[PDB]
PDB file of C-alpha atoms and ligand atoms in Angstrom:
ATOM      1  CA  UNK A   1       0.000   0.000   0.000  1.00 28.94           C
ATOM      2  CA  UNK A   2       1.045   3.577  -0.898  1.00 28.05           C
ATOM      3  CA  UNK A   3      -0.474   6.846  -0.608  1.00 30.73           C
ATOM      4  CA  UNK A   4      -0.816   7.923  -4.419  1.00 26.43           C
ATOM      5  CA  UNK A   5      -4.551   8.762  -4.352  1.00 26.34           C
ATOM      6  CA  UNK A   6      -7.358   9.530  -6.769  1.00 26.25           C
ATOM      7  CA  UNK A   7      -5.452   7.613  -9.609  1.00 24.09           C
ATOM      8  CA  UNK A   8      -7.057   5.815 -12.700  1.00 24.84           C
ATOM      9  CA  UNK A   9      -5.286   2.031 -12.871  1.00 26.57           C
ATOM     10  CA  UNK A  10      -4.272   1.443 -16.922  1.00 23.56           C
ATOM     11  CA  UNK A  11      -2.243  -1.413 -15.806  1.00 25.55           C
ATOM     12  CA  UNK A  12      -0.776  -3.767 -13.484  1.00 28.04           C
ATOM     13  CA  UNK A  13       1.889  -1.402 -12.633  1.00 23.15           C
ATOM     14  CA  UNK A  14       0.972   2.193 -14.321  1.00 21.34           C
ATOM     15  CA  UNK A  15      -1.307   4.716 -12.608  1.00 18.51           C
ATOM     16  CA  UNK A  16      -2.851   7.879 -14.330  1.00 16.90           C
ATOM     17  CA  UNK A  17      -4.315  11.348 -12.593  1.00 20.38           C
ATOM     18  CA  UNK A  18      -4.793  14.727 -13.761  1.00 23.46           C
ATOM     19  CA  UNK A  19      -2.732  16.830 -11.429  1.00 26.04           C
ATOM     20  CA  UNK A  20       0.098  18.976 -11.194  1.00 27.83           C
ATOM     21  CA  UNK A  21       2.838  17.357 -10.541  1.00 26.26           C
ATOM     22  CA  UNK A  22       4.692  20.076  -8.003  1.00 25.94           C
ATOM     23  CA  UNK A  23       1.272  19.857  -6.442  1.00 26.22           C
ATOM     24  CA  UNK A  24       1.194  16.095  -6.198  1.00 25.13           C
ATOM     25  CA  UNK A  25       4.874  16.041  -5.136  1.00 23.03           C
ATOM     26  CA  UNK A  26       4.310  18.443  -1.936  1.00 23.65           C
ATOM     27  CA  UNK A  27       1.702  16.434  -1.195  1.00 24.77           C
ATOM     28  CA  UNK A  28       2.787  12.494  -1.287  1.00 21.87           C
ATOM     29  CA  UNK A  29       6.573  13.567  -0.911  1.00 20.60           C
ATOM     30  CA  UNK A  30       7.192  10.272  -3.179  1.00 19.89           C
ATOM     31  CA  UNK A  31      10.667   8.695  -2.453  1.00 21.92           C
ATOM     32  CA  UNK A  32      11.149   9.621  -6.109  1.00 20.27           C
ATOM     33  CA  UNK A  33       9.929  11.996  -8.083  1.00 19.55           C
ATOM     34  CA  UNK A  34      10.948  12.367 -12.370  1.00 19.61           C
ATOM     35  CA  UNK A  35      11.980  16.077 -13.808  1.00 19.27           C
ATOM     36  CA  UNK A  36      11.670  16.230 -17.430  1.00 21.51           C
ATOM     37  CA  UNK A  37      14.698  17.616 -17.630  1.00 20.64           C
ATOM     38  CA  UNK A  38      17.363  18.659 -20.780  1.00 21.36           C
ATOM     39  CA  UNK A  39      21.088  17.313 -20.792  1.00 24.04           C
ATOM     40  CA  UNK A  40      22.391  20.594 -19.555  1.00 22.66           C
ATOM     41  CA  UNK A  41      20.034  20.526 -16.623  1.00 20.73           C
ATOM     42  CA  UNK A  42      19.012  23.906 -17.418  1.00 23.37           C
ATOM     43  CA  UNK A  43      15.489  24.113 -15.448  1.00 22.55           C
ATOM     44  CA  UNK A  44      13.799  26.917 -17.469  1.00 19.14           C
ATOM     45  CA  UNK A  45      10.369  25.676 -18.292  1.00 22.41           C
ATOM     46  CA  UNK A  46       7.955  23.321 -18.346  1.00 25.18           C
ATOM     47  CA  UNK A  47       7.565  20.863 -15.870  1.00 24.75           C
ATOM     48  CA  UNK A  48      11.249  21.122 -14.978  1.00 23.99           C
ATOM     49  CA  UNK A  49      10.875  24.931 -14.822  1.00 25.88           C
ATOM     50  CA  UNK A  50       7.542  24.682 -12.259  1.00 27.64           C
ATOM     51  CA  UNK A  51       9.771  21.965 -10.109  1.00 26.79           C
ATOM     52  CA  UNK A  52      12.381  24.265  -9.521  1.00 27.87           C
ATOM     53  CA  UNK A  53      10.737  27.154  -8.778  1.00 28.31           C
ATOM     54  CA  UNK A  54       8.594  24.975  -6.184  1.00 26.92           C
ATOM     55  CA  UNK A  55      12.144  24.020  -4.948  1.00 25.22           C
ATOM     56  CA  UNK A  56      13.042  27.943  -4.674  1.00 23.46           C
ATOM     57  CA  UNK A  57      16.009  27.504  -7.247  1.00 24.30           C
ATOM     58  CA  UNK A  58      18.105  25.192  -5.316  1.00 21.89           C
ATOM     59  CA  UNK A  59      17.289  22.249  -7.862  1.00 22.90           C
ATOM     60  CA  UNK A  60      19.050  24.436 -10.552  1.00 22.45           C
ATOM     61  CA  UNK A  61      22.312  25.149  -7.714  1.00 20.03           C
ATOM     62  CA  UNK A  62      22.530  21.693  -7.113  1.00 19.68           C
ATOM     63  CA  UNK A  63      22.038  21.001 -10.756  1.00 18.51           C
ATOM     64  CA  UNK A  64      24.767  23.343 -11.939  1.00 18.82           C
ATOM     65  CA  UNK A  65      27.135  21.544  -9.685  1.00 19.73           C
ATOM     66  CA  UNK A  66      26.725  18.557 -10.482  1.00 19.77           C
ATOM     67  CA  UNK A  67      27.159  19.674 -14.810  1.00 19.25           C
ATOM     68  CA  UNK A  68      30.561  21.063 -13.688  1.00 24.59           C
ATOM     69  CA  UNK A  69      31.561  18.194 -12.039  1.00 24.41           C
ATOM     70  CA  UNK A  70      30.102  15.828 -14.516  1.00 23.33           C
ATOM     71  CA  UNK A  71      29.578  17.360 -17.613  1.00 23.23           C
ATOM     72  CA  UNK A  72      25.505  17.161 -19.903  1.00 25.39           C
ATOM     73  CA  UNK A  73      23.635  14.032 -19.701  1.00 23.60           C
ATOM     74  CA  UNK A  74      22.765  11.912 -22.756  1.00 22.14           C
ATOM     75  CA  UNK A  75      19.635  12.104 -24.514  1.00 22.23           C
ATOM     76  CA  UNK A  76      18.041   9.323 -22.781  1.00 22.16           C
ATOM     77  CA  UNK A  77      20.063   9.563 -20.082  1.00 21.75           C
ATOM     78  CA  UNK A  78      19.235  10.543 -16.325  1.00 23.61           C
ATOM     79  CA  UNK A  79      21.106  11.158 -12.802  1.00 27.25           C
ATOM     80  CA  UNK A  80      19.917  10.975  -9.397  1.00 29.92           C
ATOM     81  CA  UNK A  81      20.229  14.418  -7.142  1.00 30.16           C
ATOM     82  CA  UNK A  82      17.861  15.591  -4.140  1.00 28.98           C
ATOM     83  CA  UNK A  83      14.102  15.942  -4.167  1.00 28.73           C
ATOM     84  CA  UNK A  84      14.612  19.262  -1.956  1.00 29.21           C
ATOM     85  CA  UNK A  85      11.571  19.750  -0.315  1.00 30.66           C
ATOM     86  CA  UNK A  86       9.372  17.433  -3.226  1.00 29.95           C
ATOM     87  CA  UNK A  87      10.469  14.119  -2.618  1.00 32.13           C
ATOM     88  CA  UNK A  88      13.414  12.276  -0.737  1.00 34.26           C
ATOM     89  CA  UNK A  89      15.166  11.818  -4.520  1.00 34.94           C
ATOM     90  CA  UNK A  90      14.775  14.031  -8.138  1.00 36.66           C
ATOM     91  CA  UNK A  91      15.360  11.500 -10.441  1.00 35.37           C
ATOM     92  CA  UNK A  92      16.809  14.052 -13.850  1.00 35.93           C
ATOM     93  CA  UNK A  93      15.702  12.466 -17.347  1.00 37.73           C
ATOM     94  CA  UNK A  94      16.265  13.205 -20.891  1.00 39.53           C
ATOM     95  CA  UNK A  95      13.328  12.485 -23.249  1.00 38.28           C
ATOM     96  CA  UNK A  96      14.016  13.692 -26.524  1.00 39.10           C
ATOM     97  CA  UNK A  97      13.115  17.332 -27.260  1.00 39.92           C
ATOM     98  CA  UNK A  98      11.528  17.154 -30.694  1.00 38.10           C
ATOM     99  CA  UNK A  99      11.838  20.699 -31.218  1.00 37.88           C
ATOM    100  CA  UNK A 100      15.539  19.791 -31.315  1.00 37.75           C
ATOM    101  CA  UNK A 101      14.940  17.605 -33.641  1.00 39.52           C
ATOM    102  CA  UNK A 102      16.168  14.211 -31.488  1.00 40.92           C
ATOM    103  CA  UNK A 103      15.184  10.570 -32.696  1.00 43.84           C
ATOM    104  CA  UNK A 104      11.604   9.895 -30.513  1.00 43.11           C
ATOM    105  CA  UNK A 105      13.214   6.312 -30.576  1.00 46.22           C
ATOM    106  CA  UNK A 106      15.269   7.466 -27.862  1.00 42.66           C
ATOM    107  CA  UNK A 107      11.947   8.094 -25.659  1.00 42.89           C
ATOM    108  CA  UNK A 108      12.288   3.608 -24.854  1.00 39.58           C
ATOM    109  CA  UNK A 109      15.826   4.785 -23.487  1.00 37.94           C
ATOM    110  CA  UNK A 110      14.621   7.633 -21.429  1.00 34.28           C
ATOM    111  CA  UNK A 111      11.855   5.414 -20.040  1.00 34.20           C
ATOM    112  CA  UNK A 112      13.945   2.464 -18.775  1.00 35.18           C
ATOM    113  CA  UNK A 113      15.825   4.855 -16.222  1.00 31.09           C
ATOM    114  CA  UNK A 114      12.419   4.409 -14.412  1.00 29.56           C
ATOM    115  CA  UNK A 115      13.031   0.552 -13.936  1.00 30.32           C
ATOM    116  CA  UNK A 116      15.727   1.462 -11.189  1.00 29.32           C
ATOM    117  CA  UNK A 117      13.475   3.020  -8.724  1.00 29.75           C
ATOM    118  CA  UNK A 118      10.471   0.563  -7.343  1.00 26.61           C
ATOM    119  CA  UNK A 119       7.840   3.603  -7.454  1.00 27.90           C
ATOM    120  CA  UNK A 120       7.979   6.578  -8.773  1.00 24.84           C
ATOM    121  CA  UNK A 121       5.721   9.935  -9.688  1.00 23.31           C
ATOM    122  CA  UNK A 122       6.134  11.049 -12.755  1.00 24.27           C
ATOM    123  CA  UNK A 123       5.267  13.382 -15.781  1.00 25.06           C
ATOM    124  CA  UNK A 124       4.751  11.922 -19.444  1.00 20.56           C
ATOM    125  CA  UNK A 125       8.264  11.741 -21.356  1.00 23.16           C
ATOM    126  CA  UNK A 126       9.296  13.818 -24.223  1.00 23.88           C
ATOM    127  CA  UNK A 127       5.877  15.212 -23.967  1.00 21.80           C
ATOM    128  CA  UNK A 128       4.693  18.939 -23.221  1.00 23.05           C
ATOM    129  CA  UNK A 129       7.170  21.547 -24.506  1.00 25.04           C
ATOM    130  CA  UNK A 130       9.445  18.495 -25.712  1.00 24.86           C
ATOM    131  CA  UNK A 131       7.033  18.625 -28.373  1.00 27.47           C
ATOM    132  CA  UNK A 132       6.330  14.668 -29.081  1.00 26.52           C
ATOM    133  CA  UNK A 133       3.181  13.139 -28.904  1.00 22.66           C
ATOM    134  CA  UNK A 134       1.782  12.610 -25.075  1.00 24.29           C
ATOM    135  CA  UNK A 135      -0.573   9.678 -26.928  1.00 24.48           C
ATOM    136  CA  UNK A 136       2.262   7.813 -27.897  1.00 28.64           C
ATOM    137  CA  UNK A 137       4.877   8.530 -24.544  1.00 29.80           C
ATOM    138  CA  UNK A 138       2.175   6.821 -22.797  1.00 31.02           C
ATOM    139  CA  UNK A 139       2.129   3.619 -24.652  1.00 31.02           C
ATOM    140  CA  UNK A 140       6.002   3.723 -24.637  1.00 29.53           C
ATOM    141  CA  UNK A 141       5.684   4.683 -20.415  1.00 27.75           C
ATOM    142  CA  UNK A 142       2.982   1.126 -20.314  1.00 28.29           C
ATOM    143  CA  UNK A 143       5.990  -1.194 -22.662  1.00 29.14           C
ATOM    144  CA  UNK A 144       8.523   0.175 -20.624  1.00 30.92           C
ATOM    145  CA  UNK A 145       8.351   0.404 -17.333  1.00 32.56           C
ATOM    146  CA  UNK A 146       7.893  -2.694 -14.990  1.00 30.44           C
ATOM    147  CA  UNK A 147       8.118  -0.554 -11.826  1.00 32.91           C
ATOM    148  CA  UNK A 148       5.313   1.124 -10.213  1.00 30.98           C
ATOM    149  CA  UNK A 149       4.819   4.529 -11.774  1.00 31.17           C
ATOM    150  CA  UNK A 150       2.110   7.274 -11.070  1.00 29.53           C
ATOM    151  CA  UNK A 151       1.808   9.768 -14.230  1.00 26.12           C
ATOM    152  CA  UNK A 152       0.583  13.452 -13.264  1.00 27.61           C
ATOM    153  CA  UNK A 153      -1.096  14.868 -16.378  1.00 26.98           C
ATOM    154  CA  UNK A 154      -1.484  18.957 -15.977  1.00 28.79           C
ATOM    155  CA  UNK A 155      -4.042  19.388 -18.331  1.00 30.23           C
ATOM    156  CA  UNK A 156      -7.456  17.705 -17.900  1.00 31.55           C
ATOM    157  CA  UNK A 157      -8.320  18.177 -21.032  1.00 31.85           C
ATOM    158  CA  UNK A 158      -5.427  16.061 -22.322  1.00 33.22           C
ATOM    159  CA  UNK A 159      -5.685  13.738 -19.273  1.00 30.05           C
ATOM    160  CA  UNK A 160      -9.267  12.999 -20.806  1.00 28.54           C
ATOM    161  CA  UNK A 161      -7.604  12.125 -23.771  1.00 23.36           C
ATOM    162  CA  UNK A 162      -5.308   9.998 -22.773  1.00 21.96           C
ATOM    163  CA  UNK A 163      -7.510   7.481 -20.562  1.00 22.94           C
ATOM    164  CA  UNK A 164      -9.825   7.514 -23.486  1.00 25.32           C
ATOM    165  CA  UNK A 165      -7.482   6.669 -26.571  1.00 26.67           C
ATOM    166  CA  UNK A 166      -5.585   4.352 -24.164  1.00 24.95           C
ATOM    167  CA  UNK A 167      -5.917   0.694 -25.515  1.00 24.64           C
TER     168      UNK A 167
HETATM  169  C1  LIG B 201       8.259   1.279  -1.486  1.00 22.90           C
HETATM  170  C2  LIG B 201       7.167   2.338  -1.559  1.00 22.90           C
HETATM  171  C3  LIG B 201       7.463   3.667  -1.820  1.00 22.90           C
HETATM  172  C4  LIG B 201       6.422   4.570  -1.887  1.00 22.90           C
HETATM  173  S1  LIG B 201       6.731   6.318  -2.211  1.00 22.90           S
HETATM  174  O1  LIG B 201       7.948   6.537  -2.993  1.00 22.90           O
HETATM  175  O2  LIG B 201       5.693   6.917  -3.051  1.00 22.90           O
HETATM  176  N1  LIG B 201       6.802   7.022  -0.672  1.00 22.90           N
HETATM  177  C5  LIG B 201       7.897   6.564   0.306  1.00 22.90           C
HETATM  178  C6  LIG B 201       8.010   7.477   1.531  1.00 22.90           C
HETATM  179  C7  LIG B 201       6.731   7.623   2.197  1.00 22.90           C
HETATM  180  C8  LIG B 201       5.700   8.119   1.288  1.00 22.90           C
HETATM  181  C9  LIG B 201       4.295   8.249   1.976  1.00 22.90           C
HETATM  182  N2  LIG B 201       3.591   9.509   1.882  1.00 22.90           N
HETATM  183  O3  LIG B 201       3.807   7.327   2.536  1.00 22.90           O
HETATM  184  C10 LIG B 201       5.508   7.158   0.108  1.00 22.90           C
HETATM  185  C11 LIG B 201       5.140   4.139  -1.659  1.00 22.90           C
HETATM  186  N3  LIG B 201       4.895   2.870  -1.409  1.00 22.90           N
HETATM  187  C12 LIG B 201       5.853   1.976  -1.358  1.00 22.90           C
HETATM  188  N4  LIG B 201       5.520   0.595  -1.087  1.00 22.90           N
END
């Protein structure tokens, strides 16, 4: 038993709500929770700009520490660095950024970084301002990941969407 509540069940191990996910994350404070983040960890937008501003920039100081140290992710790539005050652990990952032009193929990739962490709370991949398809990053999210994972889907309208295209 967890305490993820109010989600729709699509499968044995994938939960759907419509919800922000800062919102969510104060809420549950998940052991993990997923940024849709860039390789330069560069939180300017999007989910990845709401998270650190909920986080009062010290995701993005922590983040630019750990890009001098380490150098930019891969595309389909992720690290591990502190959930601040959203979760114990912010687990960074690259979905391709379409509006970059990066092969969606990479979005299986980005996805399997999930199947480290037992349960997670997360937004849809590659989707939003990473311009791909939020239709199709679900179906990847439910052929990918074997862990337990609990999307948060901003926009109800899309959320509605989603559970009702979702085969
Ligand atoms: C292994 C496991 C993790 C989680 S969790 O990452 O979401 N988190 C962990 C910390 C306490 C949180 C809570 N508010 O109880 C739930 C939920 N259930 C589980 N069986």
């Amino acid at each position: 038993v967890n305490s993820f509540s109010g989600y729709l069940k699509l499968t044995d191990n994938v939960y759907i709500k419509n919800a922000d996910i800062v919102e969510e994350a104060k809420k549950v404070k998940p052991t993990v929770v997923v940024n849709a983040a860039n390789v330069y960890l560069k939180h300017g937008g999007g989910v990845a700009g709401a998270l650190n501003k909920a986080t009062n920039n010290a995701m993005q100081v922590e983040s630019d520490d750990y890009i001098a140290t380490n150098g930019p992710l891969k595309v389909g790539g992720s690290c591990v660095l502190s959930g601040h005050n959203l979760a114990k652990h912010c687990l960074h990952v690259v979905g391709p950024n379409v509006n970059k032009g990066e092969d969606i193929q990479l979005l299986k990739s980005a996805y399997e970084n999930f199947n480290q962490h037992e349960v997670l709370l997360a937004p849809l991949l590659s989707a939003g301002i990473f311009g791909a398809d939020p239709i199709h990053s679900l179906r990847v999210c439910v052929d990918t990941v074997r862990t337990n994972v609990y999307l948060a889907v901003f926009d109800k309208n899309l959320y509605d969407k989603l559970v009702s295209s979702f085969l």
